[PDB]
Amino acid sequence: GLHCPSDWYYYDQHCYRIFNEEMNWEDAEWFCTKQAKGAHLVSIKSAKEADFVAWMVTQNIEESFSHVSIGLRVQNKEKQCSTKWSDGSSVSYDNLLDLYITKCSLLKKETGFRKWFVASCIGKIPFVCKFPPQC
Amino acid sequence: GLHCPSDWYYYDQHCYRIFNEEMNWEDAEWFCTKQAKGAHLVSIKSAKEADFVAWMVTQNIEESFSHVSIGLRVQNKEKQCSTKWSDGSSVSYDNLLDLYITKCSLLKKETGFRKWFVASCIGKIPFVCKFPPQC
Amino acid sequence: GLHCPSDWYYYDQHCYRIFNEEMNWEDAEWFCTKQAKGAHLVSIKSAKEADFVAWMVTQNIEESFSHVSIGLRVQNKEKQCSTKWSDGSSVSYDNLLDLYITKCSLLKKETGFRKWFVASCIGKIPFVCKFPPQC
Amino acid sequence: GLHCPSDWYYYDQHCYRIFNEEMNWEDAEWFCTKQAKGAHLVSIKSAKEADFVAWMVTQNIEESFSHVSIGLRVQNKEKQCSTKWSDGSSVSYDNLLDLYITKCSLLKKETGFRKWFVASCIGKIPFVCKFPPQC
Amino acid sequence: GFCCPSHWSSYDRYCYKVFKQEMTWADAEKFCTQQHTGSHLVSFHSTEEVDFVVKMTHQSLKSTFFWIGANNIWNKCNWQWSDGTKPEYKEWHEEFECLISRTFDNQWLSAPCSDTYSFVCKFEA
Amino acid sequence: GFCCPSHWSSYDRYCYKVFKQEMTWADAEKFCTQQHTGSHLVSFHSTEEVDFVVKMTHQSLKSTFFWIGANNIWNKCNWQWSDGTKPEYKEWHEEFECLISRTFDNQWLSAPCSDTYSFVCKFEA
Amino acid sequence: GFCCPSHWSSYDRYCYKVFKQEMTWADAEKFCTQQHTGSHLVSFHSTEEVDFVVKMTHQSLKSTFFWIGANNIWNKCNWQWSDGTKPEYKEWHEEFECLISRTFDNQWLSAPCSDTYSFVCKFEA
Amino acid sequence: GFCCPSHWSSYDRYCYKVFKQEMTWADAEKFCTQQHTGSHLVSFHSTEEVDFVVKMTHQSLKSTFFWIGANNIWNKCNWQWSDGTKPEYKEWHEEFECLISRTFDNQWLSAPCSDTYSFVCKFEA
């Protein structure tokens, strides 16, 4: 409990914690923000920190959840991000279904929480929070 | 008879037809022009269209003709098109005989109507017409 | 005694002499200067002149001395000459001990008076003088 | 006797003739000049013309002469033509003997009249004249 | 206007054709480019044009899905961590998605680029 | 003026020679360039000059045909389809024609560059 | 400020760590760069900062000597013969010296870069 | 001034030495450059200086001839045919001449560069 609140883990220079509560991406990111100054959904900025986050999630996720939101999201305002068609003409009209718009991201139990997967921003899943404690 | 007049063939996006009538190159090209908007002696702009034209001519030429005019012609006004002699001096005088001036072009039966041959513009032969129908 | 004073040796175009008297580097260099116009601690400007100087010192040094000052010295005013640390930051503070500041130079008996060694300027040793005689 | 005077030979487009009379280089070149418009000591401007000149001289030289002047001469006004010494300094003083100044040129019997040899301009030898006849 | 070749269909000033053989996105596209000069997987710039090409493929196709001409739809995105930073370090599950049309609707969806579908070619007459 | 070497003939300020050996155009030309500096297959810039060289070759030649110095006379042309376009795609029967003179007339004709004729060399005296 | 990771110690806005394994200067430095982004052999810009890191290493180290981050201290010099000239010709005994700290004092000394010491890593939190 | 090393002789502000071994011009020159910095076959810029070096070599040499430092004296010339033209085509007997001094006179002569003579080295004290 030295640099992080109770139930948070301390790794390199940040506190982390998986919340086992089901939320969509932006509700999750807003919830993270309310936990502490500078908090956000996790960001994962090297192989060592991917390692630490996967372990932490392995050890604290509730057995019946298997997807965890992380903090990567598409910025583009268009439905999908090809601005050109293969004939060179431009994508100025676009009828891609909401269901297939996958602008958020997640980790999966079935892969040891280790690679990053594109996902619908409207799914309701557990998520990991990250923030830098002060000294 | 859907996109072309009777006795014309439809291929890729143009109508074609060999006329079994003996004409010199410019009478042929003018005759083509009178058949339809944008018509001309054939032009042959790829291997697939050379293929289609050779077949068509194979199937419709009268048995006693064996040369067919196509629409390629020399633009140069001089008798022949070497402007220099091998010593570097210029061709400013020129006594080449009409008989040997071969500024038009043709297809031959004896080669399956497939390569293009230089020819006298004054020979009187059958010829192929080409034009783009409208939709 | 033709181009040099007594007890000096003549080599290529300069006179030389080891003084068996114990002096620090700057007292030695000042002493050299008093011997003749343009004199200084030796400078050694090629392999042939290193050869000649090592022989001369071999033959005239007193048996209980084994180090000889030569005229090379660090010009930098800082304690040592790394101006950067390995993290890129600058050496603007510096607590290196006088004892380990080795800004002068010397030859050693134990190596045939042949390579050059860094040394403390405050040691008191014999030294070699060099100057160009006039003709 | 069609393009050249009697006793001259016609080759490619010039007349030639060896004079068996002993003369130094400039007397020879002036003598040549008096024989005809544009005449000079021979110049030899290709392997075929070297061939023709060597044959001609082989066939007409008097048996007791064996050197023939040709028309190549040094233009430089200095005694010899090195303007620098190997130390880089300039040749501004020069005591080379007349006898060793060899600024003219010649052909030798002992080599089939085929290569060109440097020579003293003051030697008195036979010589070859060359000029272009007019048509 | 100009007319479309035999066996292709016209709408507005373009020519379209259904091909039934099933190929990857990349293969479908390349094959389209060899059927005719100017030819590529179909692209769409109007509802009216999707409806035309959906009628044409419904009338001719047994699968219900076909490639249209846009690839890599999520590789191309500007992705960013919510703490405002751009991912220098990455470990994305590698994935390539490509646009697909349906024959009973105007709406599109996607599929892995590596899968195998019937497709429609298109070019300007 | 300058005079022509032995065995060549003069007219205006040039030197000409008949060679009887029969060669391709390219060979005749190259061989001309090795007979003399300045030398090439003859070129002509006047009727008077064709007549001179025709007299010379008639008096000396048994064939009636000889190369003069122009090659590839139809390769060099700007050819164009009558619909106004320039042929990107081509399938020309490959052919190379070269200019030829006759010994009983001033007029010229052509032959394949690969055939074999007697020729005339020429250079400026 | 930011906090230092577990097992490193904080002073001012940096993070420090003692490592006991003995390495050459170059090795110590490289190894420091792999413990953490931003990490290198310690550098010092104040007495207060040497004292902090000396306390830390005294409390933890059994040798009395440790590498700090400056190399080649005499190679880098502008050396000059007293007759005012710059040595074109050289025959230096080859030598490489590197800075070293002591655990019972603030003062530094040097050692051959090739020798083997315990060291301290440092980076900005 | 500066003094000359032992075994070389001084005149004006230079140092000279006779070497007896017989070498080609090129070899003599190269060897001179290795006896001392600044050293080359002697060059001369005054009568007084030829006399000095002739006395020195007379007193020491048994041959009467020695290389001084100029090579290729006729290769270097601008040669021209008297009809005013520059020889494009050449067939020179290949020859290389080099300057030589005598020990009983101030006057010079030449020899083939490939022959073999005693020589004098010189440099600025």
UniProtKB/Swiss-Prot annotation, chains A, B, C, D:
Self-association and partners: Tetramer of heterodimers of alpha and beta subunits (alphabeta)(4); disulfide-linked.
Function as written in the Swiss-Prot or TrEMBL entry: Snake venom lectin that activates platelets by binding to the platelet collagen receptor glycoprotein VI (GP6). The indirect activation of integrin alpha-IIb/beta-3 (ITGA2B/ITGB3) also induced by the toxin is upstream the cytoskeletal translocation of GPIb, FcRgamma (FCER1G) and 14-3-3zeta (YWHAZ).
Entry superkingdom: Eukaryota
Chief location bin: secreted
Lineage, top ranks: Eukaryota, Metazoa, Chordata, Craniata, Vertebrata
Subcellular localization, as worded in the UniProt entry: Secreted
Listed GO MF terms: toxin activity
C-type lectin domain ranges (all copies): 11-135
Cysteine pairings via disulfide bonds: C4-C15, C32-C129, C104-C121
Alphabetized InterPro entries for the sequence: C-type_lectin-like, C-type_lectin-like/link_sf, C-type_lectin/snaclec_domain, CTDL_fold
Cytoplasm recorded as keyword: no
Tissues where the protein occurs: Expressed by the venom gland.
GO cellular component: a single term: extracellular region
Name listed for the protein in its UniProt record: Snaclec convulxin subunit alpha
From Swiss-Prot, chains E, F, G, H:
UniProt keyword list: Disulfide bond, Hemostasis impairing toxin, Platelet aggregation activating toxin, Secreted, Signal, Toxin
The C-type lectin domain, residue ranges: 11-125
Disulfide bond sites: C4-C15, C32-C121, C98-C113
Tissues with expression: Expressed by the venom gland.
Signal found in the keyword field: yes
Locations listed in the record: Secreted
GO MF annotations, alphabetized: toxin activity
Free-text function comment from the UniProt entry: Snake venom lectin that activates platelets by binding to the platelet collagen receptor glycoprotein VI (GP6). The indirect activation of integrin alpha-IIb/beta-3 (ITGA2B/ITGB3) also induced by the toxin is upstream the cytoskeletal translocation of GPIb, FcRgamma (FCER1G) and 14-3-3zeta (YWHAZ).
Record's miscellaneous remark: Negative results: does not act by binding to GPIb.
Family to which this protein belongs: Belongs to the snaclec family.
Assembly behavior: Tetramer of heterodimers of alpha and beta subunits (alphabeta)(4); disulfide-linked.
Protein name (Swiss-Prot/TrEMBL): Snaclec convulxin subunit beta
